[PDB]
Structure formats: structure tokens, C-alpha cells
Symmetry: D2
Subunit: 352 residues, 4 copies
């Protein structure tokens, strides 16, 4: 089996492994469309996950079931499905506590390209298919559906974590593809004014498209000072962090009103301490709740979002700026993620 | 002072009372636009709230502050403001418990046209100006603003009480002006498929406009059996009741899945017991939570929805089907509410 | 294998079935202690759950794992374990919605003595041992442990659903074994004044022992008015229904303040509609949230409640008012529950 | 009027000011018992809240209404009341958002000894008497009652923020007088195992009394490793921070399992950044919510805790280790808090 993988930190390239075999509850899927995530980049050229040798990359795919186990009941070979980035083992302690994201350990929900070969192969292995796969309606285009596995649940679980109230003002720090979905999520939660913080013209134009009402470029002065003016010094009702480094946490706390929420879905890789300003955090009493969690995965999550797209509630189409064909391009698309052109948001390779 | 009021049960007609005086914290407002509510009808021709003599009617109004109290600080004469239906007394017990709608009593938050003279007068009295009035931006049309005081908050509170989840399937029972806002509400909470239950063609055409994805007319079979078909027998994740009589509660509990929520914002007046089917209510264990409450009021509440319209989040314009002029029409508009023409949703009289 | 079962409605008696075989993920447990539930009585002598033939009864058991499936990993033969009444199939949809009680259907989480042979046999079958069993520390006495599987979770789930707040005033309608644990539940959620509604002298004495501060005997006038008296017409903050018929739902709504919550864990069998007084329910607007759900089950639920006992948080012992020995007795103890002696609360049969 | 106050940072001593005059809705109270707060110490010898000149200190008092406003209706001279540390202005925006602690600004609800003269005087001023005062039952001793205004609400609010679940394991970092009330609050939220982290013997003896089941003395190794052991490496379900500096935040995040809650009610005064270890915070994805808010104040809050004491649900008595008589000792008591003797927890001076 041919598959684009991580060779060792700082080194990738196509390799060959043995086609996976489904367990009684698993399914083997053949990619139809995939996408590279900035996370893979950090995983390969920054060892964000530790050292890994010959691990196929990728965790965002839409495929066709080619083989199922003896115990799979809802998916048969030939079925078109959307595959979640998070594919947990549903029979664990934490699944009973309500946090499947952490089934069997912190961030254990995430398997693809972490402790299991990713989706960038001629085939890949999905565990517990009846629990972790969702059928793909034929009316939803491959390009768009692939934004569902990770971009859309991360952005949306940003908006979810914020406890956004009807007509509340929400600030989104980081307008990348995840931020763009976090902006759409704030709009899906009844957000009134949505202040998107970003500087890429391609990202800002998309943000306005998804509901952004005010754009804030940091190259105009401090973010906390700009948001404060925009809100007559009232601050925002919530702040969703979708990107940036450690610092961005301080910004968040400073622009959020007392009793406000700061929801984080960004993956910090630098330093070892995320800054929480004690003065603006009411010396630990301003009731500014800070949240931060991995995006939900699993069938239901996928089906939920799939309806959101099916009923024109949101269209992830705008996130895809590049489209390529054939496996060979999985590599071209990948690198494209390492050096973000000013016209790039999210590339996708149809696998025809 | 001139004002259209309720004389005796079944009897209305213009009367004259003394122009009200502000307290140190209250304000006097001169209406700029108002709307009759079916409530008033029930209040007069059905004494839904008891016997009342010479009570100026109306509780939905957008006006101008003509006179403030000595202690009012955020409102002066000349200011255009939206006056919420619910204008509670913020210094009570229930306010500390978080239920201003019941400040000082059950539904005591509601004063206008209940224990206070309505807004259908040359002038009306608004208690606690700084806590119960909200500035109306010039860009928002009066026809529209007037829908915020009661229709939008009630409709929206329906969605709010429902505990909708991203992608969740919501069913709204009753597509009246309130139900229509409940349909926009659910869509504002990120509902996916929204099933609107109603028959009036003028109502359904709006329902589609506000997010309904499927129309269910009881004239085609039992509602419960239809929703069950549309949802492959899965049922809905939540059902908002915005109209109907006692029965409808049974429908609700029957269409919602175990674990779902039945949110009610409808005003039931007959019978003395609301039906909750034990069988499909899991014999008291299918976790189908039932909620029901008076719409929130107050400045903040209004502010929030004012922003929703301000940010083209939702447009209440479509609720206004008829626009009249001058006080005199407050009566034609009132009657018009009694006998709902097949082309009427919500009548509004401008400038008086 | 010998086992006391339900032959047909109104008829019970011992029968013999073949000893169950564990699936790769199940376990075979040998009871060490068990207890009859009023639900068995109704299930048999009132077909509360339909016609059943040769169905071993009982669902509250403590025992020893005698055989495990090839895939079980946390349980081995010889282990002492507490077995939850609810033993769901954790790989279902509703488990992703957060309601394992309804995994695969409304109330589907409950298998023992419903769709699966009960625990009143020389052996019984527990599905998904790692997800549905919990180790029993030797320091906890069997008489006590057996109260955890159903009585404890149900009563505690009463308090839980009640949304009790520190110092809140709770009322427990029905002080049977479940009400008793609902009384300890409220105390566990930091309830201040706890009003227990009941007449049996043996129950009231236990109620006082678990935290009730006032006793209300319906034999002294209408409950609704008596509680109104005790609370200067303020009413209670929440009302936990732990027994009664359908009429109790009304009493509940009537004693709860606007914004309060009615939490019901009682299994209603009569009639086909649970009354909800529209008047005192604010005509559908006093915000009186009504909740009612089956008790949670599974390993975790059992581990949590086990620690409560282990750390002397609560002592179920007082619930056990009779102790028998040997299977023979499983029948005498069964009958004992049909005709509640004025000195009975909960009988338990030791060792098998 | 005689009163012990803050002359300027680092300097204190009695001073004289004019007896305060009640506004239409206020009340003047004469102290019957009061107590020093570690915070006054910081506020004075560490300017934790800025420079201040001649500000009467203290915020924890039980007194006698000596004069009420013309508008006050629930309080008359002679009445014995408990006066909450937090005494907000109930007619603000933040109050409609449900955070009276921040009425008029961040932490703005805390007036006493912050922006208003404290309770350490012959008389003191209480704004909004009907909203911010609560009657003290004669059965509750003064020593005990003075522990309600700040210690109890803060400790309890810690447990409240933690989102503790029945049987959940909770850790309390810091067992000071507030931490002792968080240990009590945890037990009041249904906690099973409660791990108290502290070294002062008089504090641990009290900790055990309030429900602590395990004592962790940092002088035996790293707290995180000790808790990890005690918990088989599982970690705690919640961590309430009631003392320590910045670092303690790191400890919390390191001992709480994924999906756990770090609830802070500690007042941090050093540095400008509270540490949040990215590694063990799941790099911003371990779903380890961090909370932290000012203790609730107001009449209702006080009435709730008063009931808790009235129904022997908790007894603050053991927090009081010293008692003194007359004003003169308010200073002896104050200094007693600056240099914590090994036998001190909370000093109270009776008869003002
Ligand atoms: Cl704003
Ligand atoms: Cl559907
Ligand atoms: Cl009371
Ligand atoms: Cl443990
Ligand atoms: Mg579909
Ligand atoms: Mg505006
Ligand atoms: Mg243990
Ligand atoms: Mg009392
Ligand atoms: Zn990416
Ligand atoms: Zn109307
Ligand atoms: Zn029973
Ligand atoms: Zn203190």
C-alpha cells in the first residue's frame, strides 16, 4: 500500500505499508478526498507529538468503505462516509464522564496521525465504524464535506465552549480555517456582533462571509485597546481563541467582561505556561471562565454537522481555496500547508 | 390624556385619564409605534387575567421619552427607545434568584396592560427607566423595532429554553408571530432541520423565510405521526410550543426523543390541567424535560435583541403585515387582531 | 440453574434455565446479596411492563464474578462487585447524546428483569463487564452495598435533577426507600431545610436520620397548604417526587416557587396522563421546570456512589430492615415487598 | 465617630469620621461582632488594591440596625442582621447578566473596605438595606454568624464553581479559614473523597472536622505526585484553590483529570501572570475548565447560608479560635492576622 508519511522528525515522503485489516468492529476506508492540517506540519517539522517513524499522515478525510468487520452493522463496502479526526474507543471510563475526546487518556480520542496511521494512504483503518463513521449525503460536495472532520467541529466547539447568549458580542482571536468556523459557530449560537481578529486579507474576506461584523488587524495597535474602543469599553461577552501563541490567552482575558467566557480550541505548542493576567482576571475573581478542549468526534458529531451543511445552515466551501487530484498531490498540498501562500486557507485533493 | 382601553369584560373604547407622573426613577414615554397582541384580545373578550375597569391596553411599543424622573441617568427627553413588554421591579427576591419575569410575584414582571395602563395612550409610564428602557438606533425601522418588545423575546426564549445543540432537529408547534420568532430563535441557536407545524399559508411562507425547512399541516394527518415519518422515527431533539391549546403539550412530549426538551412559551387559558402523556413520557423517566416561562424583559434583554437586528442577524419586518397611522387606528388594529384575516400576522400603527 | 422468576402476570415461582454463557465482553456473576423492588411486584402482579413469561426477577444485586469473556480486562473470577440496575449497551447513539439510560430505546438501559433475566438466580449475565461492573471494597458490608444498584442512584438522581442550590429548601414527596435516598441526596447537594412528605412511622424515623428537618403527614390536611404554611407562603425551591400516583405531580407544581424545579424519579403506572396544573404552573410561564428520568447506571455511577459510602458520606444500612439467608428466602423476601409490613423498608437476602 | 482604619499603605490606627447618613434606601448599622480578613492585611501592608487614605477597614460583620432610610421596608432600628462582605448596587447591567459581584465594574460588588468605609467603626453604612441585609436568628451565636459574610460564601462558592458530582473526588489546595469552608462546601455538594492540602496542624484538625478524608502536607514531596498516588494516577475530579500564590494554579491543572474543573476563589496579589501548564492542560484541549470568581453577596445569599447553619448543616464555630471584647481589640485582632500564630484560624471580637 502506498502512503504519504512522516519518516522521522523533519522528514516526510511516500512509503509502503501493509493494507490494514479490519477487526470485527472496524472498517477499512479508501480516500475520496483529504486535506492537510497545520497540525501535521507541527507534528513532522516540530515534533509537537514526539518522535514517530513511518506513520502515514492526515486526519481529515471523506472516503468509501471498502471493507468492514464481521460486527459492523451500519456501514457496507461502497458507502460514502465522512470520517471524524477524533475516532475514540467508546468503551472507556471517560466516555462515561462525557469526554470521549479523552477516551483512554488525555487527547486519546485523536488517533489518526498520532498513534494510528493517518488517512493519507491508499487505504486507512477506522476503529468502531458504527460508532465513528457517518454517511455522506450525495448532495454534499467532497470539497466541502472534508472541512467537517476537523475544521468544522473545532471551530464549532469553540463557539460551544463560550456559552454564547443571544445577541452577545463575541470576539474571535485567530481567523484561520478553524477561526473561520469558530466565527460561523458564534453566528450559529445567536451571536450578535462578531469581532474577528486577523490580518490575512484572504482570511478576513472569508470571515466577513461567515458573519464577522468588525475586522481587527493587530497592525493598527493593541488588540485589547481596539476591542475596548469598539465596545465603548464594555468588552466582549466571550472570546474564542482559534490561534496565536501563549500570549493570545492574556489578550483574551483582557477583552472579556467579568462573568464572560474565554473558549479555546487552539493548539499551543510553544513554552510551558499559558499567561493568565491576574490583574484583569480580577485577581482570580472576575468570573472569567477559561475553557479549552479538543474537538468532538464520532458519528453523531459528524451527522450533526452534516445536517448543518445539508440544510444550508453553513457552507464550508469558502474554506477550500485550492483543489488538486490524485495521491501524488497529497504531497504538494501538504507542503502548501507549511508555507501558507497569501491566498491559501485550506487545500484539498479530490482522490478520484 | 387620550387612550384606547378596556372598560368592562368584552368592552373596549377610548377614555381619558390624567397624564401619568414619573417617579424619581421612572420615565414617561410618548409612543412612536405600537402593536396589538392576541393577548389583549384574550384579556378583554376572555378576561384571561381577571376583571379590569378602564385599563389602557397594549404592551408592545417603541416611543420617545418625553419626561424623566430626577434619578434617571441614561434617558432624557427626546430619546427614542424600545419599551419591553416586561418591566419588572429590579429590587425584589426573585431578581436575585434570576427570574425577573417573576419579580414580586408569578408573572409580576409583566405590568403594561395587566396592573398598569398599557401603551395605547397619548402617554404611558415606564418604571425604572435606566433598568427597563433601551435606546433605539436610528437605522432600525419602527415597524421592526416594535416586534422586539414581545414577539422576538418570547419567540427567542422558546429556543433558549429548548437547549438546542448545533445541528439538532427542532420542531416548533404553532407558527403564529411568536412561533415565527421561535423558528428564527432555533435557527439562531444552531438548529439544523427545523420543522414548523402550522396551516395558515401567510404564516408558513414566513416560517420558510425564518428558517423552517419542513412545513407540517395537521390537515394531512396526526402531527406526531408525521414528524415521526420525517425523522425516520427518531423524533426531534426539541419541540417549542408557541401556540395551540392544552393538547399540544401531549404532541410535544410525543415527538421529542428521550433526553430531549419540551420548551413552552405559549399562554394556555383554558382547562385547568396541561396534558403530559405518561406512556411516551417514559412513565416519568424518559428524561424529556418540560420548560415554560414568561419572556424576559428589561433593558439588557432588549439591548441584546436590538443588536441582533442591528447586525442583520434577523429581520422582524416580515412579521408586520399591516401598517396604520394615528391613534384612531389603534382600534382598527385592535379589532383586526380579534378576527385574524388570512393575510394578517402582526399589525402595527405608526406615529401615535 | 435455579432461579426465582415471573411465570406470567400474577404468577411467580422458581424455575430452571441453563447457566448463561459470557460473550467476549460479558461476565457471569454469582449473587452474594440481592433485594426485591416494589417494581418487581408491579411488573408481576400489575404487568407494569407488559406480559412476560419465565423471566427471572430482581435487578439489585451484589455478587462474585465467576466467569468472564475473553475480552473482559478489569474483572476476573473471584472478584466481588456491585452490579447496577441499569446495564446499558455503551455503543449506541443516545450514549453519545449523554443518556445511557436510554441506550437503544426509551428506558432501554434497564435490562435486568425487563428484557434480560434478573439477578434472582444461582447466576446471572452482565453485559459489558468492564463498562458495567464495579469492584466492591471489602470494608463495605453486603447489606449496605445492595442498596447502591437502584435505591441510591434513583434517590440521588432525584436530588441531581432537582438543581438544588446551597441552602435551598427542598421537599421530598414520598419517603419510601427511594425517597429516603432522595432525602439524603438533597442533603448531599447542600439543601438547607428538607421537608419529607410521608406517614409510615418507620420511614419518617429514617427520613429524620437522613436529613429531613420537618415531617409532613398528609393525614393533617392538604400537603400544598401545609408546606405553604411552613414556608410563610414562600414555597420550596425544588420538589423531588419519589412516589405516589399522578396526583403528586400537581402537589409538586403547587409547592414550588416560580423558577423552581420539579424533579421526578417515580415510576408512574396508573392513568395515561400526569396532571400539570396550568394555574399554579403560571399558565405555562412560571418557569417551573419539570424533570423526570431513569436512574443512571454503569460502572462509573457505581464507583462514585461506592466512594460516598466508603467515605462515610451516607449510610444505606438504615434502609435494610430485614435480612434473610439462602435462595429459598428470595421468595419470602419477594412476597414481603408485596404486603409492606409497617416495619419494612427494604429486605435483603444474604449470600446468594 | 471612632473607627480603626487604613491611614495609608503600611499604616493603620483609629481615626474619627462623621457618622454616616442613610440615603432613602440605606441603613446605618452598629457592629455587634466583626472579624479581620487576611485581605485587609494585604490591602494595608501590601497595597493589593491601591493607595487609600483614612479608609475604615473590615468587611465581615454582624450588627444592629440603628437607623434606616425612609424607603427601607424590611429593616428597622434594633434588628439584628448579618451584613455580607459583598453589598452591590442591584440596579446595574451586570446584575441583569447575573453577576452582582461585579455590579458597576469588576469586583465592584465588594464595597466595604474597598471603596466604602468598612465595618470596623462605631457605625457603618449599608447601601440598599432591603437587598443587602439579612435577619440573624437568635439561635445563631454571634461568633458563628460573623463567619457567614465572607468565609462561608467564599468557601462555598469554591465548591459551587467546581461542578462537583455526587461521589466525585475533590482536592482543596490551601486549608485556610476559606479553604476549610471549601472543604465543607465540597461535602455539601455531594463530594466523596476530599483531599485537603495544608501543613498547619490547627488547620488540618479543622479540615478533618469539615469532611477532609486525606491530608496532604507539601513537606512530604510534590503535591501533584502525592495526589496522583492517593488516586492511583487517576487524578481528582476537581480542585478548589483557596490559598497559595500563582504556582498553585499549575498544581491544580496538574492534579485535575481531563474534563475536570479548577475552581479558584483565592485572591492572588503577586506577579502579573497566573501559570497554566500547557502540557498538562492538554495544550489547550484537556477540557480542564478553569473558574475563578468573587464570593456572592446580598441578602438572599446570606439567607441561604444562614439556613445552612440554622439546620445544623454546617457549623463555622471551629473557624473561630480567638474571641475578644470591645473596639479596642479590633486592633489586637487585626494585628493577630498579620502574624498568624500556629493556633490561629479566624479571630472575632464580640460586642463590637
Ligand atoms: Cl457593543
Ligand atoms: Cl433527521
Ligand atoms: Cl423557610
Ligand atoms: Cl480515588
Ligand atoms: Mg440527513
Ligand atoms: Mg447598537
Ligand atoms: Mg475507593
Ligand atoms: Mg429560616
Ligand atoms: Zn489545518
Ligand atoms: Zn401579539
Ligand atoms: Zn424497590
Ligand atoms: Zn479573612
Amino acid at each position: 500500500m502506498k502512503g504519504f508519511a512522516m519518516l522521522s522528525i523533519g522528514k516526510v515522503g511516500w512509503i509502503e505499508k501493509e493494507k490494514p485489516a479490519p477487526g470485527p468492529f472496524d472498517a477499512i476506508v479508501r480516500p475520496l478526498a483529504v486535506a492537510p492540517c497545520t497540525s501535521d506540519i507541527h507534528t513532522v517539522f516540530e515534533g509537537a507529538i514526539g518522535e514517530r517513524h513511518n506513520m502515514i499522515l492526515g486526519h481529515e478525510a471523506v472516503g468509501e468503505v471498502v471493507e468492514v468487520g464481521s460486527e459492523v452493522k451500519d456501514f457496507k463496502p461502497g458507502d460514502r462516509v465522512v470520517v471524524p479526526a477524533i475516532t475514540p474507543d467508546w468503551r472507556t471510563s471517560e466516555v462515561q464522564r462525557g469526554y470521549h475526546q479523552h477516551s483512554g487518556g488525555m487527547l486519546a480520542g485523536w488517533k489518526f496521525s498520532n498513534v494510528k496511521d493517518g488517512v493519507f494512504g491508499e487505504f486507512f483503518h477506522v476503529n468502531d465504524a458504527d460508532m465513528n463513521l457517518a454517511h455522506l449525503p450525495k448532495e454534499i460536495p467532497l470539497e466541502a464535506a472534508v472541512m467537517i472532520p476537523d475544521m468544522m467541529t473545532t471551530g464549532f466547539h469553540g463557539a460551544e465552549l463560550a456559552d454564547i447568549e443571544l445577541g452577545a458580542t463575541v470576539a474571535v482571536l485567530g481567523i484561520g480555517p478553524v477561526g473561520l468556523m469558530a466565527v460561523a459557530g458564534a453566528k450559529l449560537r445567536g451571536a450578535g456582533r462578531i469581532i474577528a481578529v486577523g490580518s490575512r486579507p484572504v482570511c478576513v474576506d472569508a470571515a466577513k462571509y461567515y458573519g464577522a461584523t468588525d475586522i481587527v488587524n493587530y497592525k493598527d495597535g493593541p488588540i485589547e485597546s481596539q476591542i475596548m474602543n469598539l465596545t465603548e469599553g464594555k468588552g466582549v461577552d466571550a472570546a474564542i481563541i482559534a490561534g496565536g501563541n501563549a500570549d493570545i490567552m492574556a489578550t483574551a482575558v483582557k477583552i472579556v467582561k467579568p462573568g464572560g467566557t474565554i473558549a479555546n480550541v487552539n493548539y499551543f505548542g510553544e513554552g510551558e505556561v499559558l499567561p493568565v493576567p491576574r490583574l484583569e482576571w480580577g485577581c482570580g475573581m472576575a468570573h472569567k471562565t477559561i475553557k479549552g478542549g479538543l474537538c468532538p468526534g464520532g458519528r453523531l458529531r459528524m451527522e450533526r454537522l452534516i445536517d448543518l451543511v445539508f440544510y444550508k445552515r453553513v457552507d464550508p466551501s469558502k474554506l477550500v481555496t485550492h483543489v488538486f487530484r490524485g495521491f501524488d498531490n497529497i504531497e504538494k498540498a501538504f507542503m502548501l500547508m507549511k508555507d501558507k501562500p497569501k491566498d491559501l486557507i485550506k487545500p484539498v485533493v479530490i482522490l478520484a
